[model samples]
Target: RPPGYEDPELLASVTPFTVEEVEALYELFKKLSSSIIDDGLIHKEEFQLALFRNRNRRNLFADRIFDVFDVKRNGVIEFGEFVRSLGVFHPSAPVHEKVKFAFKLYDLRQTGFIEREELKEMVVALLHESELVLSEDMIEVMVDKAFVQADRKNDGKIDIDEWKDFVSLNPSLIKNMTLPYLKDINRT
Candidate 1:
């Protein structure tokens, strides 16, 4: 018995995955963890290799995903953390939950609200991830345009209610939030 999160605990903790799905994920997780080192944990650099094919490629988008997946902020990923963090991306995951997760990613400062600057920075990172480039001013304008709609209180920060409405209007913004492969993980 290895010193990893117990299967029973994970079964209760991660609602989006079944016992069988978790078992399946273990196969993939083992490959990711052992790719760069012997330990069972996935470190920051190792994640990038698994994420982008090159650890040298700097992208805040991946880092943000890494941060969310890390869960403990202990500098490495554990099996339990991997399942809980990834459970949100399961195709069966509720949209409201996925919307809340996106809200967390947008709130970079952990301040409970999405500030304009935080939104801008994350959008910048997202654009970079897709190999898209924009004039500096163009980026600002883009942020401003979206911000104006969601910052309905005129407080310059997006609250959950406002964010809910924003997502409601632009349903496709988070279409990438789900992984259809997750459905198959449990079924077959």
Candidate 2:
């Protein structure tokens, strides 16, 4: 067991990650926490580098993810928070939480809603991740189409409720939100 395993409540807090899985995640955490240096904390660059293998690329999505992972809002992700935050992605995690997190991912400005500019940026990032470059014209059209469908109030923004409704109408939007391996975390 890892150092923190003695506290059953701590482990229980990150449910679905049994002792074995916690131990496994602890090992992975050690590696990730130590990446980019040996400071035992994950900075935004460290997380970006660890996930994308390139830290220089400007990625709003990754930045937003780092912001979420850094629950303390201290601009860094400590080991404890790392494991706990990652647990939020477990396949069994509630869809509401996933939907909320996904909404925050697009809410780059953290303004409690996804603005048009934020949605445009996320679309560009998504396209980049998929290695599918689109013309500037196409990108604008895509963002406009999304707003046309999702901004139900004609407010040019998507609030959490609106986003939830949009996702409910189109279930596939969150299809990849779950990380299957998180549900089956095993010692290697």
Best by TM-score: 2
Alpha-carbon TM-score of each model against the true structure:
0.81, 0.82
What residue runs in model 1 are displaced by over 4 Å at the alpha carbon? 54-59, 124-134, 186-188
Computed on alpha carbons, the lDDT of every model, listed in order, comes to: 0.78, 0.75
- Model 2, stretches more than 4 Å misplaced? 1-9, 54-60, 128-131, 186-188
- Model 1 residue pairs with clashes: none
lDDT of 1 at 146: 86
For candidate 2, list the clashing residue pairs, or say none.
none
lDDT of 2 by residue, 12-49 (tens): 56565777776676677667777777776777777877
lDDT of 2 at 130: 71
